[PDB]
Amino acid sequence: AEEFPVPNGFESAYREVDGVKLHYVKGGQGPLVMLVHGFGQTWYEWHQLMPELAKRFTVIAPDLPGLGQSEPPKTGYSGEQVAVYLHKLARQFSPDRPFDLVAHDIGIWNTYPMVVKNQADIARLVYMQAPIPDARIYRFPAFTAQGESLVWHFSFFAADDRLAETLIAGKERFFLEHFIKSHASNTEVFSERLLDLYARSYAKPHSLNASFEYYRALNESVRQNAELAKTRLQMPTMTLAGGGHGGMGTFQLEQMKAYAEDVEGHVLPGCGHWLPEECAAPMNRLVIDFLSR
Amino acid sequence: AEEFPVPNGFESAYREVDGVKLHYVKGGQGPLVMLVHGFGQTWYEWHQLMPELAKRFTVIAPDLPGLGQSEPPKTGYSGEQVAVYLHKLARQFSPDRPFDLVAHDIGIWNTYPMVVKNQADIARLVYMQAPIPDARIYRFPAFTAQGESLVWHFSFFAADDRLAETLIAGKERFFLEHFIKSHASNTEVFSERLLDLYARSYAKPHSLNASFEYYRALNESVRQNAELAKTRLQMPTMTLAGGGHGGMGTFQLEQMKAYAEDVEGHVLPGCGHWLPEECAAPMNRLVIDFLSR
């Protein structure tokens, strides 16, 4: 019944949060670290980091609402709405201590509002490989002198008429493999077995739709964040980005400098978008050291 | 067999040009005007303008290579390669006199090189609703505060692994309706009957692939034009652009001023991309008046 194999010593479980049944994988002991995945993926993208982190922390990795084995949200897909589910989930497990947060891709979109509104609950923050929704996203190019651009998919996924679901249905494995590899530097880490697992998961009709609903809410999140951003983040923050094909480069740290007072950043040469898989060992090391300081 | 109904008094015919059988519709008497369609359509987009122009001109409307009933090109799909076919076709019917040219969308891409290389063969020029391929196209955004951007489809159509044909095959009628209407202001001119006609034509497998090969050659066309643009156009030119949803707005004229010495531009309010259909009366009047000087 599990969509992905659970690491030894971890449990797959469910918690109801505001009427929404969320799936997560949990292990370890100590202060809580929540890990939040992004588009095309599930909790499983963290499966190499989780056992190392569980040596020193309690580690929880949820499926975003509607993705993996988590139920769709009953409110909506904008960042402020989804962030409520994730914040209350973390609070069920760390009610008496601030917790750490690591997020990738749209996991950023779905956590930033709860970080900025509940700063006393967040001990340390790691964000990798996606902009915080704001006006800067309107500057990315539609097309480049080398071919397809990094984020033309924002428009593809946000289009109405269920454009993305209709074109991708029946071709979910084909599309996801193209999407992953077109934003990767290191494609060999994506075995046919691994692509099969991710494709089977997001091909569930409610999960295919949920994937794109995050993008259909992106302009709403941008508008939400315009007000939230008047309060800068005060906790220690680290950004990570790939320096290779598919990576955000220096954008990640430069944007975060406008949001956070105490921020450090690293660009990983030879790595693209999918840092936990393409560049697991150095990504894991940087996260662990930053969180363990 | 005709994919579209020929206007009364016109003939549907073919002509072999450098080994490629081009389809065209021809009527009228007098000096030659060639009308060149763009993406998603065929010669038929001109069918309301042709009877009017034919009162004063010989009018020819070819199908672009690979599209409508024309064979794919044997050289390639870059602007400079395709323009050879169109120039030679026009000169078969106007061997000793300059002709007029009207082009829409990627018809611009496929005619600009033969215009700049054979300026004495072009009496007057009308371009509407697309950039000439140059470095400006790398500045359009992937995503806008309103949502879908104008030209995110550049990356989609240019993507490798035949991404666009693989996703759109079997769904051509769905996709073309969405593409056309999302770039329109006056959407109700696109009846189901008309969409059926256009979709059946570009769903031919070689036409679906040809459609996207034009975008796969776009960066080559940009590199070609960087050299060709060192000479400005000297003949009278007019640009038209829609001012409504889907329209190029002031960009059309502002770019043309870098390419032409003698240019007047119009922005048609309440009109999007598909000027001949969305705004037939004002567009036809503008074109007929400009060519009748």
Side-chain angles (χ1 to χ4, degrees):
Chain A
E2 281 306 292
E3 289 183 338
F4 302 86
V6 176
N8 182 73
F10 282 72
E11 76 165 10
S12 167
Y14 299 82
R15 286 298 174 86
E16 192 95 331
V17 182
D18 288 351
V20 176
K21 183 171 167 174
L22 301 171
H23 172 248
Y24 62 92
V25 174
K26 170 177 173 291
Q29 40 68 54
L32 181 68
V33 184
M34 176 164 58
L35 312 176
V36 188
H37 74 86
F39 168 82
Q41 304 200 288
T42 63
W43 73 269
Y44 188 67
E45 78 162 285
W46 306 112
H47 83 275
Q48 307 176 74
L49 175 66
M50 287 164 79
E52 294 164 44
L53 219 45
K55 295 169 183 153
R56 308 169 172 182
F57 303 87
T58 299
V59 179
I60 185 168
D63 288 330
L64 284 173
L67 304 177
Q69 297 163 204
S70 281
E71 290 188 337
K74 284 180 173 50
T75 48
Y77 288 88
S78 71
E80 251 187 297
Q81 290 167 311
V82 173
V84 173
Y85 296 110
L86 297 174
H87 181 240
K88 291 176 161 175
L89 179 65
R91 289 290 294 177
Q92 294 192 9
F93 295 94
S94 189
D96 309 326
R97 262 182 309 190
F99 61 90
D100 295 332
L101 180 64
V102 183
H104 182 207
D105 186 71
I106 66 170
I108 295 167
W109 305 359
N110 290 308
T111 57
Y112 166 72
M114 71 107 159
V115 172
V116 73
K117 291 188 292 180
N118 305 280
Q119 292 205 36
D121 298 338
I122 307 293
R124 295 184 193 168
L125 181 68
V126 179
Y127 273 176
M128 64 186 77
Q129 275 298 130
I132 301 176
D134 66 22
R136 295 172 174 82
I137 69 173
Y138 306 137
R139 284 190 192 270
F140 284 92
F143 187 66
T144 79
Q146 294 87 31
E148 65 172 294
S149 72
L150 252 277
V151 305
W152 69 263
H153 70 272
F154 288 12
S155 278
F156 182 30
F157 295 172
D160 76 332
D161 293 329
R162 288 166 64 89
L163 176 68
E165 298 96 325
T166 303
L167 296 193
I168 292 173
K171 304 289 182 167
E172 300 88 349
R173 166 59 188 279
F174 169 85
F175 176 78
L176 188 54
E177 179 177 359
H178 180 277
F179 187 88
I180 286 164
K181 292 177 166 179
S182 83
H183 296 88
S185 294
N186 312 328
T187 59
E188 208 174 88
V189 313
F190 288 101
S191 61
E192 313 302 289
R193 160 72 167 178
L194 179 55
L195 299 171
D196 283 334
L197 288 179
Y198 283 138
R200 285 182 181 102
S201 178
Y202 100 125
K204 305 193 299 295
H206 76 264
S207 291
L208 189 62
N209 171 249
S211 298
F212 306 133
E213 288 299 327
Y214 286 103
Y215 294 81
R216 293 173 188 140
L218 177 55
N219 275 323
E220 188 179 5
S221 298
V222 170
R223 295 188 291 272
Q224 290 170 346
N225 292 351
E227 301 293 270
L228 297 170
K230 297 184 281 121
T231 303
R232 294 193 77 186
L233 304 179
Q234 297 296 139
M235 73 290 302
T237 302
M238 179 173 71
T239 62
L240 299 180
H245 180 73
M248 301 289 318
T250 61
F251 179 94
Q252 191 86 39
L253 173 66
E254 291 308 298
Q255 171 182 59
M256 193 69 205
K257 285 184 181 172
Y259 286 73
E261 295 269 19
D262 175 16
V263 61
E264 64 177 76
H266 303 285
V267 179
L268 282 63
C271 306
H273 176 73
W274 313 97
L275 294 189
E277 282 126 338
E278 293 182 61
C279 294
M283 194 217 76
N284 289 359
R285 176 52 44 208
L286 294 164
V287 171
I288 290 163
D289 286 345
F290 176 74
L291 293 184
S292 302
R293 281 208 294 275
Chain B
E2 289 306 311
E3 293 184 331
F4 304 85
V6 176
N8 193 280
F10 287 65
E11 60 164 342
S12 162
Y14 299 83
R15 191 149 182 101
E16 202 79 30
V17 176
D18 292 349
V20 173
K21 186 185 310 303
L22 305 169
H23 174 243
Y24 63 91
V25 178
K26 178 176 175 299
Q29 224 194 291
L32 182 66
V33 178
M34 180 166 62
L35 315 170
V36 182
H37 71 88
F39 169 84
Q41 300 189 298
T42 65
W43 73 268
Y44 189 68
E45 77 160 296
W46 304 115
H47 80 279
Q48 304 188 66
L49 175 59
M50 287 157 70
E52 295 172 335
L53 276 180
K55 299 195 188 78
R56 328 177 194 246
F57 300 98
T58 303
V59 183
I60 58 155
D63 288 327
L64 287 175
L67 306 190
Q69 295 156 215
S70 290
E71 294 189 332
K74 290 167 99 182
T75 54
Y77 287 90
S78 70
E80 211 173 336
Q81 283 164 314
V82 174
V84 178
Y85 295 105
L86 300 177
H87 178 241
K88 288 184 168 179
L89 175 66
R91 293 292 277 176
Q92 301 317 308
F93 303 93
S94 191
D96 310 306
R97 293 284 306 178
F99 57 94
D100 292 337
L101 180 69
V102 181
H104 182 194
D105 185 51
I106 64 164
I108 295 171
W109 305 0
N110 290 315
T111 54
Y112 167 73
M114 68 106 160
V115 172
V116 69
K117 291 199 269 176
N118 308 276
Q119 291 206 42
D121 295 358
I122 310 302
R124 310 171 74 84
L125 179 70
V126 180
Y127 275 174
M128 58 184 83
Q129 276 295 134
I132 295 169
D134 67 22
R136 286 175 179 82
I137 73 173
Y138 307 132
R139 300 179 74 247
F140 286 88
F143 189 67
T144 73
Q146 295 69 32
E148 258 207 48
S149 65
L150 276 182
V151 299
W152 71 261
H153 67 270
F154 285 10
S155 278
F156 181 31
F157 296 170
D160 295 309
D161 302 339
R162 298 165 67 98
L163 175 72
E165 297 101 321
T166 304
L167 299 189
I168 293 169
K171 305 148 194 147
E172 307 86 352
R173 172 64 172 78
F174 167 78
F175 174 79
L176 189 60
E177 178 165 355
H178 173 85
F179 185 90
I180 290 175
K181 287 189 179 179
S182 73
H183 289 93
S185 176
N186 190 9
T187 58
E188 81 275 10
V189 304
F190 294 104
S191 68
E192 300 299 308
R193 170 177 183 96
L194 184 62
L195 293 167
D196 287 347
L197 288 171
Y198 283 130
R200 287 167 89 174
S201 176
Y202 99 126
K204 302 191 302 294
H206 75 256
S207 296
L208 184 67
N209 169 255
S211 296
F212 305 136
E213 289 302 317
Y214 285 104
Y215 296 79
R216 284 155 197 169
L218 183 57
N219 281 326
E220 177 168 11
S221 299
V222 170
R223 296 189 297 268
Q224 287 161 0
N225 292 347
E227 291 316 286
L228 299 173
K230 289 180 180 170
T231 298
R232 270 195 208 90
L233 306 174
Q234 306 292 321
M235 76 284 302
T237 78
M238 183 181 64
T239 61
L240 304 185
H245 185 85
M248 300 295 305
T250 57
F251 174 95
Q252 193 77 44
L253 175 60
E254 289 309 295
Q255 176 193 47
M256 192 62 60
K257 287 185 182 169
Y259 286 82
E261 305 275 23
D262 179 5
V263 51
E264 62 178 73
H266 302 275
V267 173
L268 283 58
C271 312
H273 182 70
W274 315 97
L275 303 186
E277 269 121 357
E278 293 184 56
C279 293
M283 192 212 75
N284 288 358
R285 178 50 64 191
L286 285 169
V287 171
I288 292 157
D289 287 348
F290 181 75
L291 298 184
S292 300
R293 294 179 206 173

PDB file of all heavy atoms in Angstrom, chain B residues 27-44:
ATOM      1  N   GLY B  27      -6.385  34.067 -56.740  1.00  0.00           N
ATOM      2  CA  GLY B  27      -7.479  34.686 -57.462  1.00  0.00           C
ATOM      3  C   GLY B  27      -7.166  36.139 -57.728  1.00  0.00           C
ATOM      4  O   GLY B  27      -6.176  36.687 -57.238  1.00  0.00           O
ATOM      5  N   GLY B  28      -8.032  36.767 -58.517  1.00  0.00           N
ATOM      6  CA  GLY B  28      -7.887  38.178 -58.780  1.00  0.00           C
ATOM      7  C   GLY B  28      -7.044  38.443 -60.002  1.00  0.00           C
ATOM      8  O   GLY B  28      -6.612  37.537 -60.716  1.00  0.00           O
ATOM      9  N   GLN B  29      -6.807  39.732 -60.240  1.00  0.00           N
ATOM     10  CA  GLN B  29      -6.063  40.204 -61.400  1.00  0.00           C
ATOM     11  C   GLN B  29      -5.328  41.478 -61.003  1.00  0.00           C
ATOM     12  O   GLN B  29      -5.805  42.242 -60.160  1.00  0.00           O
ATOM     13  CB  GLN B  29      -6.995  40.469 -62.597  1.00  0.00           C
ATOM     14  CG  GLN B  29      -6.482  39.946 -63.928  1.00  0.00           C
ATOM     15  CD  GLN B  29      -7.252  40.513 -65.116  1.00  0.00           C
ATOM     16  OE1 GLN B  29      -8.427  40.199 -65.322  1.00  0.00           O
ATOM     17  NE2 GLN B  29      -6.590  41.357 -65.900  1.00  0.00           N
ATOM     18  N   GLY B  30      -4.170  41.706 -61.615  1.00  0.00           N
ATOM     19  CA  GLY B  30      -3.377  42.877 -61.316  1.00  0.00           C
ATOM     20  C   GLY B  30      -2.090  42.532 -60.591  1.00  0.00           C
ATOM     21  O   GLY B  30      -1.653  41.377 -60.581  1.00  0.00           O
ATOM     22  N   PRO B  31      -1.455  43.532 -59.971  1.00  0.00           N
ATOM     23  CA  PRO B  31      -0.203  43.279 -59.244  1.00  0.00           C
ATOM     24  C   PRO B  31      -0.387  42.237 -58.150  1.00  0.00           C
ATOM     25  O   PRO B  31      -1.476  42.078 -57.589  1.00  0.00           O
ATOM     26  CB  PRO B  31       0.147  44.649 -58.651  1.00  0.00           C
ATOM     27  CG  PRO B  31      -0.591  45.634 -59.505  1.00  0.00           C
ATOM     28  CD  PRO B  31      -1.854  44.949 -59.913  1.00  0.00           C
ATOM     29  N   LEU B  32       0.704  41.542 -57.834  1.00  0.00           N
ATOM     30  CA  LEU B  32       0.658  40.394 -56.934  1.00  0.00           C
ATOM     31  C   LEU B  32       0.768  40.812 -55.471  1.00  0.00           C
ATOM     32  O   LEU B  32       1.627  41.627 -55.109  1.00  0.00           O
ATOM     33  CB  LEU B  32       1.781  39.413 -57.262  1.00  0.00           C
ATOM     34  CG  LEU B  32       1.783  38.152 -56.396  1.00  0.00           C
ATOM     35  CD1 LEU B  32       0.545  37.316 -56.685  1.00  0.00           C
ATOM     36  CD2 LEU B  32       3.062  37.328 -56.595  1.00  0.00           C
ATOM     37  N   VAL B  33      -0.100  40.240 -54.638  1.00  0.00           N
ATOM     38  CA  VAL B  33       0.021  40.301 -53.184  1.00  0.00           C
ATOM     39  C   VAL B  33       0.050  38.873 -52.671  1.00  0.00           C
ATOM     40  O   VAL B  33      -0.840  38.076 -52.993  1.00  0.00           O
ATOM     41  CB  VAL B  33      -1.142  41.074 -52.528  1.00  0.00           C
ATOM     42  CG1 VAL B  33      -1.003  41.061 -50.993  1.00  0.00           C
ATOM     43  CG2 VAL B  33      -1.212  42.500 -53.062  1.00  0.00           C
ATOM     44  N   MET B  34       1.057  38.555 -51.867  1.00  0.00           N
ATOM     45  CA  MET B  34       1.165  37.251 -51.231  1.00  0.00           C
ATOM     46  C   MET B  34       0.833  37.421 -49.754  1.00  0.00           C
ATOM     47  O   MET B  34       1.361  38.330 -49.106  1.00  0.00           O
ATOM     48  CB  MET B  34       2.565  36.652 -51.405  1.00  0.00           C
ATOM     49  CG  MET B  34       2.714  35.269 -50.744  1.00  0.00           C
ATOM     50  SD  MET B  34       4.189  34.316 -51.223  1.00  0.00           S
ATOM     51  CE  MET B  34       5.469  35.400 -50.627  1.00  0.00           C
ATOM     52  N   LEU B  35      -0.062  36.573 -49.244  1.00  0.00           N
ATOM     53  CA  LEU B  35      -0.496  36.573 -47.842  1.00  0.00           C
ATOM     54  C   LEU B  35      -0.003  35.292 -47.189  1.00  0.00           C
ATOM     55  O   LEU B  35      -0.290  34.200 -47.692  1.00  0.00           O
ATOM     56  CB  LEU B  35      -2.026  36.628 -47.723  1.00  0.00           C
ATOM     57  CG  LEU B  35      -2.817  37.610 -48.590  1.00  0.00           C
ATOM     58  CD1 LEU B  35      -4.305  37.328 -48.484  1.00  0.00           C
ATOM     59  CD2 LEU B  35      -2.526  39.014 -48.145  1.00  0.00           C
ATOM     60  N   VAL B  36       0.706  35.413 -46.062  1.00  0.00           N
ATOM     61  CA  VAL B  36       1.380  34.269 -45.445  1.00  0.00           C
ATOM     62  C   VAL B  36       0.866  34.096 -44.018  1.00  0.00           C
ATOM     63  O   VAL B  36       1.093  34.963 -43.166  1.00  0.00           O
ATOM     64  CB  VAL B  36       2.907  34.429 -45.450  1.00  0.00           C
ATOM     65  CG1 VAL B  36       3.555  33.181 -44.837  1.00  0.00           C
ATOM     66  CG2 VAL B  36       3.429  34.701 -46.861  1.00  0.00           C
ATOM     67  N   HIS B  37       0.222  32.958 -43.758  1.00  0.00           N
ATOM     68  CA  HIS B  37      -0.415  32.641 -42.483  1.00  0.00           C
ATOM     69  C   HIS B  37       0.627  32.272 -41.426  1.00  0.00           C
ATOM     70  O   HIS B  37       1.822  32.151 -41.708  1.00  0.00           O
ATOM     71  CB  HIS B  37      -1.400  31.485 -42.657  1.00  0.00           C
ATOM     72  CG  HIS B  37      -0.740  30.154 -42.896  1.00  0.00           C
ATOM     73  ND1 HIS B  37      -0.349  29.320 -41.865  1.00  0.00           N
ATOM     74  CD2 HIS B  37      -0.371  29.531 -44.042  1.00  0.00           C
ATOM     75  CE1 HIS B  37       0.225  28.239 -42.368  1.00  0.00           C
ATOM     76  NE2 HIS B  37       0.232  28.346 -43.687  1.00  0.00           N
ATOM     77  N   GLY B  38       0.158  32.051 -40.192  1.00  0.00           N
ATOM     78  CA  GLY B  38       1.042  31.626 -39.119  1.00  0.00           C
ATOM     79  C   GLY B  38       0.641  30.342 -38.416  1.00  0.00           C
ATOM     80  O   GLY B  38      -0.090  29.512 -38.966  1.00  0.00           O
ATOM     81  N   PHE B  39       1.100  30.183 -37.179  1.00  0.00           N
ATOM     82  CA  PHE B  39       0.925  28.927 -36.456  1.00  0.00           C
ATOM     83  C   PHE B  39      -0.537  28.660 -36.127  1.00  0.00           C
ATOM     84  O   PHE B  39      -1.282  29.570 -35.766  1.00  0.00           O
ATOM     85  CB  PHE B  39       1.732  28.949 -35.161  1.00  0.00           C
ATOM     86  CG  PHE B  39       1.404  27.816 -34.240  1.00  0.00           C
ATOM     87  CD1 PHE B  39       2.009  26.578 -34.396  1.00  0.00           C
ATOM     88  CD2 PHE B  39       0.470  27.978 -33.227  1.00  0.00           C
ATOM     89  CE1 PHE B  39       1.698  25.527 -33.549  1.00  0.00           C
ATOM     90  CE2 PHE B  39       0.154  26.911 -32.385  1.00  0.00           C
ATOM     91  CZ  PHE B  39       0.772  25.706 -32.550  1.00  0.00           C
ATOM     92  N   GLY B  40      -0.926  27.383 -36.198  1.00  0.00           N
ATOM     93  CA  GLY B  40      -2.272  26.972 -35.873  1.00  0.00           C
ATOM     94  C   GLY B  40      -3.259  27.128 -36.998  1.00  0.00           C
ATOM     95  O   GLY B  40      -4.409  26.686 -36.859  1.00  0.00           O
ATOM     96  N   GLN B  41      -2.856  27.733 -38.115  1.00  0.00           N
ATOM     97  CA  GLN B  41      -3.787  28.077 -39.172  1.00  0.00           C
ATOM     98  C   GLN B  41      -3.179  27.703 -40.516  1.00  0.00           C
ATOM     99  O   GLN B  41      -2.142  27.039 -40.593  1.00  0.00           O
ATOM    100  CB  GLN B  41      -4.141  29.567 -39.091  1.00  0.00           C
ATOM    101  CG  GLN B  41      -4.792  29.924 -37.772  1.00  0.00           C
ATOM    102  CD  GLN B  41      -5.332  31.323 -37.754  1.00  0.00           C
ATOM    103  OE1 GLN B  41      -4.583  32.294 -37.903  1.00  0.00           O
ATOM    104  NE2 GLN B  41      -6.633  31.444 -37.581  1.00  0.00           N
ATOM    105  N   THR B  42      -3.854  28.133 -41.578  1.00  0.00           N
ATOM    106  CA  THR B  42      -3.488  27.844 -42.956  1.00  0.00           C
ATOM    107  C   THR B  42      -3.816  29.079 -43.778  1.00  0.00           C
ATOM    108  O   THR B  42      -4.213  30.119 -43.240  1.00  0.00           O
ATOM    109  CB  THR B  42      -4.269  26.642 -43.506  1.00  0.00           C
ATOM    110  OG1 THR B  42      -5.665  27.000 -43.567  1.00  0.00           O
ATOM    111  CG2 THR B  42      -4.079  25.389 -42.630  1.00  0.00           C
ATOM    112  N   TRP B  43      -3.740  28.935 -45.106  1.00  0.00           N
ATOM    113  CA  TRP B  43      -4.156  30.024 -45.984  1.00  0.00           C
ATOM    114  C   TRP B  43      -5.552  30.539 -45.632  1.00  0.00           C
ATOM    115  O   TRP B  43      -5.867  31.709 -45.870  1.00  0.00           O
ATOM    116  CB  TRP B  43      -4.149  29.546 -47.434  1.00  0.00           C
ATOM    117  CG  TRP B  43      -5.305  28.604 -47.724  1.00  0.00           C
ATOM    118  CD1 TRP B  43      -5.302  27.248 -47.638  1.00  0.00           C
ATOM    119  CD2 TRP B  43      -6.632  28.982 -48.124  1.00  0.00           C
ATOM    120  NE1 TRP B  43      -6.553  26.747 -47.975  1.00  0.00           N
ATOM    121  CE2 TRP B  43      -7.382  27.796 -48.275  1.00  0.00           C
ATOM    122  CE3 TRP B  43      -7.252  30.211 -48.386  1.00  0.00           C
ATOM    123  CZ2 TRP B  43      -8.722  27.802 -48.669  1.00  0.00           C
ATOM    124  CZ3 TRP B  43      -8.589  30.218 -48.758  1.00  0.00           C
ATOM    125  CH2 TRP B  43      -9.307  29.020 -48.902  1.00  0.00           C
ATOM    126  N   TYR B  44      -6.400  29.678 -45.067  1.00  0.00           N
ATOM    127  CA  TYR B  44      -7.804  30.014 -44.836  1.00  0.00           C
ATOM    128  C   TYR B  44      -7.992  31.193 -43.888  1.00  0.00           C
ATOM    129  O   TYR B  44      -9.053  31.822 -43.910  1.00  0.00           O
ATOM    130  CB  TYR B  44      -8.543  28.790 -44.288  1.00  0.00           C
ATOM    131  CG  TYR B  44     -10.056  28.946 -44.218  1.00  0.00           C
ATOM    132  CD1 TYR B  44     -10.823  29.027 -45.382  1.00  0.00           C
ATOM    133  CD2 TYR B  44     -10.719  28.959 -42.994  1.00  0.00           C
ATOM    134  CE1 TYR B  44     -12.213  29.150 -45.315  1.00  0.00           C
ATOM    135  CE2 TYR B  44     -12.103  29.073 -42.922  1.00  0.00           C
ATOM    136  CZ  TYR B  44     -12.840  29.170 -44.083  1.00  0.00           C
ATOM    137  OH  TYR B  44     -14.220  29.280 -44.016  1.00  0.00           O
TER     138      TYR B  44
END
